[PDB]
Design a protein around this nucleic acid. Structure first.
Length: 188
DNA sequence: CCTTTCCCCCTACCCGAAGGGTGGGGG
């Protein structure tokens, strides 16, 4: 079925060995976290299907101790995606959170620290008028293959999942590093 | 391209003395 294919493609595109899976209750707004390996995520798909059908939104992000260069950019249009691709900020995957509403994961390197990923997230959110609240190194993204429960139920779709490092990836790390240490120099 | 999804392990209390049986909570 289409749910399992979407998850698999997404896990491949994100490339992480381990993930945090967030299950948010639509009534209380309470997030339930589960650290799973990629294989465990797929193993617990029937449960994730059940919780979703029982009115829970399903979210995904790399595990806390995972070495990665993934950065979430949330609340995008398809024109914003075209801008990203034309400016070297090609997403590793694009997720349709609700009809005609998108978000993207950008891979800047095979590995980058939280402090660099945090800076790049703030820059990427500003560059493409993305949601500034979603700009931090540990923000949850939607997991495709599940229904959107807040909207207003439509399926969350994985539009593309090439999983390649962004062209501006290495450059984004270089710039963030300089910006961080220049701000660190402004200590007095 | 784009479906209509549907779990299971851990543990307080139980009788009635020693550990296994059972319900409820919750990830």
């Amino acid at each position: 079925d289409r749910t399992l294919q979407a998850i698999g493609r997404q896990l491949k595109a994100m490339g992480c060995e381990r993930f945090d899976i967030g299950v948010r209750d639509a009534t209380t707004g309470q997030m339930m976290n589960r650290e799973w390996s990629a294989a465990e995520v797929l193993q617990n798909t029937p449960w994730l299907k059940r919780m979703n059908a029982q009115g829970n939104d399903v979210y995904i992000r790399p595990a806390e101790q995972e070495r990665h260069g993934l950065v979430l950019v949330d609340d995008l249009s398809e024109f914003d995606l075209d801008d990203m691709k034309a400016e070297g900020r090609e997403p590793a995957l694009v997720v349709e959170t609700s009809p005609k509403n998108y978000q993207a994961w950008v891979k800047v390197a095979d590995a980058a620290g939280g402090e660099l990923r945090g800076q790049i997230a703030r820059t990427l959110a500003s560059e493409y008028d993305a949601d500034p609240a979603s700009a931090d190194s540990r923000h949850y993204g939607r997991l495709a293959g599940f229904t959107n429960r807040k909207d207003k139920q439509p399926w969350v779709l994985l539009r593309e999942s090439k999983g390649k490092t962004a062209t501006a990836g290495p450059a984004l790390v270089q710039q963030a590093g300089q910006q961080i240490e220049q701000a660190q120099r402004q200590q007095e």
